[PDB]
Ligand binder design. Sequence first.
Ligand SMILES: OC[C@H]1O[C@H](O)[C@H](O)[C@@H](O)[C@@H]1O
Ligand SMILES: OCCCCC[C@H](O)CO
Length: 404
Amino acid sequence: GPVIRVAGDSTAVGEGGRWMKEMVEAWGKKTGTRVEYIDSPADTNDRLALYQQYWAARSPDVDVYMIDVIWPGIVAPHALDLKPYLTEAELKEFFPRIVQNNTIRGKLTSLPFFTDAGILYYRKDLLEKYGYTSPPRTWNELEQMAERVMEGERRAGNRDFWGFVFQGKPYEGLTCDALEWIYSHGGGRIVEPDGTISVNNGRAALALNRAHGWVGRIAPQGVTSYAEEEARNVWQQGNSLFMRNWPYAYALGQAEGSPIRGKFGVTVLPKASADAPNAATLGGWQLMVSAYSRYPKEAVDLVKYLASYEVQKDNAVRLSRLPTRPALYTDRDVLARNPWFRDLLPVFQNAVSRPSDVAGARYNQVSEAIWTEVHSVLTGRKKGEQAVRDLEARIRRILRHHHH
Ligand SMILES: OC[C@H]1O[C@H](O)[C@H](O)[C@@H](O)[C@@H]1O
Ligand SMILES: OCCCCC[C@H](O)CO
């Protein structure tokens, strides 16, 4: 019979790749269908380049791909339209924003699988130890707390201790972090949904200068090479007061044998002042059936199983990854395990998107300009003023002649 082959998630980031393979194997066993799991690299932009090799070849060697929220405009030609396979009632069980994101020129490219939003992780033991009663609401508070706790922990002998870790590597995760910095300073969305390239402004420049100010000070010098897992590792060993990261790190930090089990909370990221908007970059992954799959019916059946209530529930409970089904946010077992899903649902609802809708198939080019210019501020090569001017110019070139 058919072998249904899946590329999605990575064994190099948390438990995602291991769990994904488990769920695919479970479907294969339940249905009596042979399956195979193809592993991927950690970083989204590396995965995109890998999967583009299969798509360029029209390869039948992968039936189902797990695709990033930022990808539908890029990957649509390589997707089977899922619209004919779902009833309107079934499609409405997912958040409409994510279904809309995944729909390109009326083609439903992929089913929502898990969503994502950037959040602040904080050591509540350490805040209490240093006399703080709440996590920081502003970036200045974060920096003050980080300076004071670091001074204390270093003096007490922990030479590995930092105030803040985040994703500063030159890759897609930095565009995510940087959108949060920019938007939380009142600097806008880099490219607005209407197409206006708005990033050349003083608030965006301040946000990037502020981030430069952390590097080698409250954050390690090596932060400029950190992706999700590098940040998580410093944090999880107990060596950072704060971390910006996605929901998956919560369950990993609560696992038996984690040094920080029971010692942390999560909240919204800080912002520049009380009237700035809260920033949490929208992330998340979708399930696409390949336009090149020899087994579309079987592949659709697998994608509907993976996106189902019970599989998303297992992802929430075991991996602290955010459902794309509103009903799971009221599920007693989801909430008992992850009470912060209720607390931060409005943050997840108001998450700010990267400019993938407006850039469409040119999004990865836009993003590479963003992360490269941002990275030049983090390293002290450019000031934020120059970087936003240069970024404006690059994005204008990239998007010249691109409409809608
Ligand atoms: O590193 C950036 C990536 O992080 C997470 O995987 C998010 O879910 C994804 O949307 C984002 O592009
Ligand atoms: O693993 C599938 C979950 C079904 C649970 C619904 C439950 O009764 C919510 O309390």
